[PDB]
Design an enzyme around this catalytic site. Structure first.
Site, PDB file in Angstrom:
ATOM      1  N   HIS A  26     -19.472 -50.843  15.713  1.00 35.79           N
ATOM      2  CA  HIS A  26     -18.396 -51.584  15.938  1.00 35.79           C
ATOM      3  C   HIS A  26     -17.865 -51.220  17.324  1.00 35.79           C
ATOM      4  O   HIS A  26     -16.905 -50.197  17.119  1.00 35.79           O
ATOM      5  CB  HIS A  26     -17.277 -51.898  14.605  1.00 35.79           C
ATOM      6  CG  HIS A  26     -18.088 -52.282  13.543  1.00 35.79           C
ATOM      7  ND1 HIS A  26     -18.883 -51.622  12.706  1.00 35.79           N
ATOM      8  CD2 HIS A  26     -17.920 -53.602  12.861  1.00 35.79           C
ATOM      9  CE1 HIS A  26     -18.978 -52.298  11.604  1.00 35.79           C
ATOM     10  NE2 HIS A  26     -18.527 -53.669  11.883  1.00 35.79           N
ATOM     11  N   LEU A 115     -11.249 -53.727   3.768  1.00 32.17           N
ATOM     12  CA  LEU A 115     -10.325 -54.239   4.311  1.00 32.17           C
ATOM     13  C   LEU A 115      -9.020 -54.125   3.474  1.00 32.17           C
ATOM     14  O   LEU A 115      -8.850 -54.575   2.348  1.00 32.17           O
ATOM     15  CB  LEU A 115     -10.368 -55.577   5.325  1.00 32.17           C
ATOM     16  CG  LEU A 115     -11.577 -55.287   6.226  1.00 32.17           C
ATOM     17  CD1 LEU A 115     -11.951 -56.777   6.698  1.00 32.17           C
ATOM     18  CD2 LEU A 115     -10.971 -54.613   7.623  1.00 32.17           C
ATOM     19  N   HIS A 260     -17.233 -57.623  18.290  1.00 32.31           N
ATOM     20  CA  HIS A 260     -16.758 -57.055  16.983  1.00 32.31           C
ATOM     21  C   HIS A 260     -17.491 -56.048  16.394  1.00 32.31           C
ATOM     22  O   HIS A 260     -17.219 -54.815  16.036  1.00 32.31           O
ATOM     23  CB  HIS A 260     -16.337 -58.100  16.024  1.00 32.31           C
ATOM     24  CG  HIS A 260     -15.482 -57.692  15.046  1.00 32.31           C
ATOM     25  ND1 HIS A 260     -16.357 -57.112  13.749  1.00 32.31           N
ATOM     26  CD2 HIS A 260     -14.425 -57.329  14.407  1.00 32.31           C
ATOM     27  CE1 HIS A 260     -15.639 -56.689  12.933  1.00 32.31           C
ATOM     28  NE2 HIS A 260     -14.562 -57.079  13.329  1.00 32.31           N
ATOM     29  N   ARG A 355      -0.046 -46.119 -26.751  1.00 34.34           N
ATOM     30  CA  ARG A 355       0.812 -46.197 -25.682  1.00 34.34           C
ATOM     31  C   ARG A 355       1.841 -45.532 -25.608  1.00 34.34           C
ATOM     32  O   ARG A 355       2.560 -45.008 -24.750  1.00 34.34           O
ATOM     33  CB  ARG A 355       0.952 -47.677 -25.340  1.00 34.34           C
ATOM     34  CG  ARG A 355       1.871 -48.332 -26.336  1.00 34.34           C
ATOM     35  CD  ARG A 355       2.181 -49.798 -26.094  1.00 34.34           C
ATOM     36  NE  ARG A 355       3.069 -50.460 -27.141  1.00 34.34           N
ATOM     37  CZ  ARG A 355       3.732 -51.386 -26.968  1.00 34.34           C
ATOM     38  NH1 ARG A 355       4.403 -51.688 -25.728  1.00 34.34           N
ATOM     39  NH2 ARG A 355       4.550 -51.780 -28.143  1.00 34.34           N
ATOM     40  N   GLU A 414      -0.647 -54.756  -8.687  1.00 26.10           N
ATOM     41  CA  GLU A 414      -1.361 -53.878  -9.435  1.00 26.10           C
ATOM     42  C   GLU A 414      -2.683 -53.364  -8.409  1.00 26.10           C
ATOM     43  O   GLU A 414      -2.655 -52.105  -8.346  1.00 26.10           O
ATOM     44  CB  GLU A 414      -2.319 -54.640 -10.387  1.00 26.10           C
ATOM     45  CG  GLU A 414      -1.699 -54.870 -11.482  1.00 26.10           C
ATOM     46  CD  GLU A 414      -1.245 -56.243 -11.427  1.00 26.10           C
ATOM     47  OE1 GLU A 414      -1.428 -56.923 -10.523  1.00 26.10           O
ATOM     48  OE2 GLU A 414      -1.055 -56.647 -12.639  1.00 26.10           O
ATOM     49  N   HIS A 477      -6.089 -61.790 -21.715  1.00 32.71           N
ATOM     50  CA  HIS A 477      -5.536 -60.439 -21.478  1.00 32.71           C
ATOM     51  C   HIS A 477      -6.116 -59.485 -22.132  1.00 32.71           C
ATOM     52  O   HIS A 477      -5.949 -57.984 -21.853  1.00 32.71           O
ATOM     53  CB  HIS A 477      -4.238 -60.502 -22.141  1.00 32.71           C
ATOM     54  CG  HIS A 477      -3.117 -61.257 -21.271  1.00 32.71           C
ATOM     55  ND1 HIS A 477      -3.256 -62.565 -20.971  1.00 32.71           N
ATOM     56  CD2 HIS A 477      -1.877 -60.706 -20.919  1.00 32.71           C
ATOM     57  CE1 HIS A 477      -2.018 -62.885 -20.070  1.00 32.71           C
ATOM     58  NE2 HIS A 477      -1.258 -61.768 -19.865  1.00 32.71           N
TER      59      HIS A 477
END
Lengths: 676, 676
Positions: A26, A115, A260, A355, A414, A477
């Protein structure tokens, strides 16, 4: 014809020549960003001979495809990377891979290319720096005062992860973060007019960032330097510097998508060289005056580090306890015997959800290990909150915390949490950082999680509500594929502890880690303390929980299914079948044990059945038959879902008995055996 | 005390009573959004007795945890959902799961709950409506003129996927999209002041959205209705309506995080009922006047649909060919014999990359199947572009395309592309839509991909650059875990075609699909046309490519490794070993074949070795030994990487010979056999 102009041309032509030699890569963004790279590196404090100086400024190339630019800077400044390495750009085994990798490239802080990631990593580096400075700096002792410089392009600005991290960075008032947008109006699909017409600057103002615009970033290095100075005066906002550039500046094909991501034509490279005063017959030229100029900056930076070392020595005299703590962290060592704080359980103790066991561990170890910080995203405070005796990481101006705080409110973000954790780890200073969410939504952060593994960062996901055991929230979930996905990724420890002792072993592994990210899969529902568990045995990743010398079958299980297997053993005894039980809290740790240890757990000569209420993928490594859940879940009370899918003592026993019968008259060898 | 006020109270109390009966779920947002839900549904055109009317307005609850609100609306309007179903909220097997699922809930357009998804689905519904209207509407024939209404909360606004989709929706000038932000300042971690302090409205203006603010959305249904009218006048911008509400409005605990996600106290419910004129001793009350009012709106909507049916009949007379096409699509049928356009190859044809074969397929089928539309994200036009003879989907005002266009420029927005594809599928009208990116970055969209599977939508990912075969971009771009992840997810067809005929079979499956999403894993590098391949055989998902009646081993492979296996067979012949070859282009399709067909491909009595340059997870379903790649890749020329990892004819042959030796003297049964 100044040395600065010659340096910029040198950078541009090194990058172009590297792409040309590889016939891959690039050239466009390196050509457009060389002036900015020159200006930024001249403002940065760094030592090419000590890449780990803790008070260095950090640079991140979020637009990682432009790495011929980064490699050229590192070469010119005398990092452990040479022109000979540039000639091997994108060649198998080289120190100059097609996207930069922190494990392979001296001076690459993080692994970028995918990206959006690098800007989020920069947010994490800056977050860590603020926390670190708040922890250690004292009057007359600016132990930490460094900046985080990030280059990014239009692609990073379109990826949602960067929006998440930029919203959070603005909220956190991270004034030592300075990002530079390569505003060149070109992406792979052609003009940004085709899909990216938003007002980026207005969006960044809405996040609380400061803006500086440089209208002619193809030439105006004075304005780029001034933009950095301006950004440094705005101590309570991250800054975005808009660099209006021409992609491929100087090329016959400048300002087109074609520059590019593909090598330039040979005649184009000749005219570049001639227009900038270089020999068109020569490649990889490094004018000695450029080297001299860059060496002068290095020498000045090395004197700055030398004075920092003396400041640190004086700090150790003035602040003996903080100084020793800081020294230990810079040596990469945890506190002596820190693990004596890990909770230990016996089979007489009450049942507890893993947990909650995890919360208890964190509450015990956070006060004793200052380099632990962490947070949560998309999760109730009742499911994870800061440890008692600490405060949230917030700018003090908000009244909601302080930069000395230890608990990060990531918001419903997240993916950015995952990439920010990578940046915190990349900062160094032994940071052991964690991020909580539901296991099923760790998947939202897969792009960053994979990079934790590739980058060898010891980050930890505290991933609760691991299965259909969560109950009523239902199949949207409830994880099915999630552990298989991450176990199939190289270099991820995926702990699924069954009880208190296993949860402590999981944290011992996660906190001691230096090169392997961890995911801790934890339950909503209560589980019993197991007869036979210990931190010692669980630390091996897999171990014999119930030994049966005359076993007709061994049941291997994880997490909530270990207690199920133990209950099935009792049902089987009534059917005349003798079973052993193996607990396999982390497959990666187990795999790393000796072959003889592993065979002592999974021997030849006995059928082995796996039980885990999730995908059966991977389980044939350890078993002959697999009882798992390969369909989506259901919305209802958790015990009723387990019954529906026959994850009951009787359902396991039935499948164990069928397994014994299936292998009658057959010779059975360990699943650990293979032909090659 | 108007009927509208009574309706709002009825909605609120049905939702609260449903949460109370389940002792699980989310009462706060239903209480806060009931006025808006009442106002929006009164403006919507829909038929509870015909949930598939193609010109209905669509509603999407992006804040899916608030689904007690949606279920209450559906019950009150006489969808196929009753008060008895509300009493079974969050109960195993009910029609009222804890988050709404389109497969289970009449009137749920999409499956929501995972935050951020629904707003993106709404973008896709609106995109499809614009494309559909541009394709079919004529003067005096507004076949399609419907709106897309979306409710969302702070959590959706923090998730990066919604930023991606909102940027794109603003670019696309989607004026029939009207979204409503529940601006209640509360999330699970407490105040939005802790992590979400950005200026949302300024950000949405930066995307090119229109804004309406309703300052008292707890009561001002006149202003909510007026906001909808205002939004409908702005035909070239999507609109965001800011609804300033009190979470849990009316509760003693209103305006607190505690009402977000847990049942109210019984005494709180009593005072709610008393303050709104209901009997505190009664639950699930539905006042007959509310039913009457809602029935009147239904009757009016049904007369609107009746008139639409007559418009459609008149359209078929005025526009015979378009009318028949539209009828066929509404019947869910593809054009007769459409698959005769699929390209067919022979072993005499040249080697071609499967990414190029895929482009060729699309170029042949797009002109013949009008319900195919698609696009790409984070990918060069040279890797995927529109089919010749079409135009991009863009607002005509840009000059860059038209809404009648067929190719969507998603920008660098993989996750939003995935969720938008789900919305396009949800629109209906037989849309068969696709999205291109690199296989490794399908992972960025995992949240949406999983929902494609759970929602049973026939979307297609065109996922090129599938392996180390991509070469120089290196390990940040090279999939390892990706196919295992998606194959481990229920209901995903993962095609990895080896050649031209297999690529046509993959598209036949993807386009014919009605309930199963597809991922097509495609190569950068050229592959030979195989002796023995056909669309017919590849359509079975797995087939015997080379039959060897006296086989010492069968090699099962996919994609680029099938040709490798065929070359290894020749090496093995020189070693005195006879091999067969199986090609397994889609494991899901293969699994669905009859047991006898599958055993004809993977018989008893012969060792089976799998070969695929990716994770070995899953492969034990089909093989005794597995040759895969369970480490990250490398940056270099692709053939050199294959050689490094011994994915060569000699490397495969060596492992095949070791497999034959390992099973000498052993009884071998098909991997398809199991104990249960």
């Amino acid at each position: 014809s100044s040395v600065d102009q010659k340096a910029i041309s040198t950078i541009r032509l090194l990058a172009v020549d590297a792409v040309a030699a590889a016939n891959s890569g690039h050239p466009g963004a390196p050509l457009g960003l060389a002036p900015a790279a020159h200006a930024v590196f001249k403002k940065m404090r760094f030592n090419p001979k000590d890449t780990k100086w803790i008070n260095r400024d950090r640079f991140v190339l979020s637009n990682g495809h432009a790495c011929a630019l980064l490699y050229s800077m590192l070469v010119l400044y005398g990092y452990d990377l040479t022109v000979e390495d540039l000639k091997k750009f994108r060649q198998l085994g080289s120190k100059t891979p097609g996207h930069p990798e922190n494990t392979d490239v001296p001076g690459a802080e993080v692994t970028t290319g995918p990206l959006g990631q690098g800007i989020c990593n920069g947010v994490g580096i800056a977050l860590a720096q603020a926390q670190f400075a708040a922890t250690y700096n004292k009057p007359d002792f600016p132990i930490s005062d460094s900046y985080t410089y990030v280059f990014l392009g239009d692609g990073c600005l379109m990826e949602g992860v960067s929006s998440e991290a930029s919203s959070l960075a603005g909220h956190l008032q991270l004034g030592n973060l300075i990002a530079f947008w390569d505003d060149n109006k070109i992406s792979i699909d052609g003009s940004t007019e085709v899909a990216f017409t938003e007002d980026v600057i207005a969006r960044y103002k809405s996040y609380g960032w400061h803006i500086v615009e440089v209208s002619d970033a193809d030439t105006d290095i004075t304005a780029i330097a001034a933009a950095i100075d301006e950004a440094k005066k705005v101590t309570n906002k991250p800054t975005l510097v808009r660099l209006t550039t021409t992609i491929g500046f100087g090329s016959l094909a400048q300002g087109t998508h074609g520059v590019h991501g593909a090598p330039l034509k040979a005649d184009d490279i000749k005219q570049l060289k001639t227009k900038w005063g270089f020999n068109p017959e020569e490649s990889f030229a490094v004018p000695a005056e450029v080297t001299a100029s860059y060496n002068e900056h290095v020498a000045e930076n090395q004197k700055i580090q030398q004075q920092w070392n003396e400041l640190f020595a004086a700090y150790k005299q003035k602040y003996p306890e903080l100084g020793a703590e800081l020294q230990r962290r810079l040596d990469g060592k945890l506190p002596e015997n820190w693990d004596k704080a890990l909770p230990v359980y016996t089979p007489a103790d009450a049942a507890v959800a893993t947990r909650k066991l995890s919360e208890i561990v964190l509450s015990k170890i956070i006060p004793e290990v200052p380099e632990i910080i962490g947070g949560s995203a998309d999760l109730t405070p009742s499911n994870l909150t800061k440890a008692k005796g600490t405060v949230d990481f917030q700018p003090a101006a908000t009244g909601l915390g302080d930069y000395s705080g230890r608990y990060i409110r990531y918001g419903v973000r997240e993916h950015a949490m995952g990439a920010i954790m990578n940046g915190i780890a990349a900062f160094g200073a032994n940071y052991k950082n964690y991020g909580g969410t539901f296991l099923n939504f760790v998947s939202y952060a897969a792009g960053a999680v994979r990079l934790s593994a590739l980058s060898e960062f010891p980050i930890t996901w505290v991933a609760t509500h691991d299965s259909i055991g969560l109950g009523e929230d239902g199949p949207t979930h409830q994880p099915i594929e999630t552990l298989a996905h991450f176990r199939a990724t190289p270099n991820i420890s995926v702990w699924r502890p069954a009880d208190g002792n296993e949860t402590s072993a999981a944290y011992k592994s996660a906190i001691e880690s230096t090169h392997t990210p961890h995911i801790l899969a934890l339950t909503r529902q209560n589980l019993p303390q197991l007869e036979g568990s210990s931190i010692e045995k669980a630390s091996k990743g897999g171990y014999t929980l119930v030994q049966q010398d005359k076993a007709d079958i061994i049941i291997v299980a994880t997490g909530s299914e270990v207690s199920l297997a133990v209950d099935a053993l009792k049902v089987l005894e009534g059917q005349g079948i003798k079973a052993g039980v193996v607990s396999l809290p982390d497959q990666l740790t187990f795999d790393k044990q000796s072959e003889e240890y592993k065979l002592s757990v999974l021997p030849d000569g006995v059928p082995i059945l796996s039980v885990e209420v999730m995908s059966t993928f991977g389980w044939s490594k350890y078993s002959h038959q697999q009882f798992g859940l390969n369909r989506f879940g259901a919305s209802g009370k958790a015990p009723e879902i387990f019954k529906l899918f026959e994850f009951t003592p009787e359902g396991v026993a039935e499948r164990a008995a069928k397994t014994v019968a299936f292998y009658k008259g057959k010779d059975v060898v360990s699943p650990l055996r293979s032909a090659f």
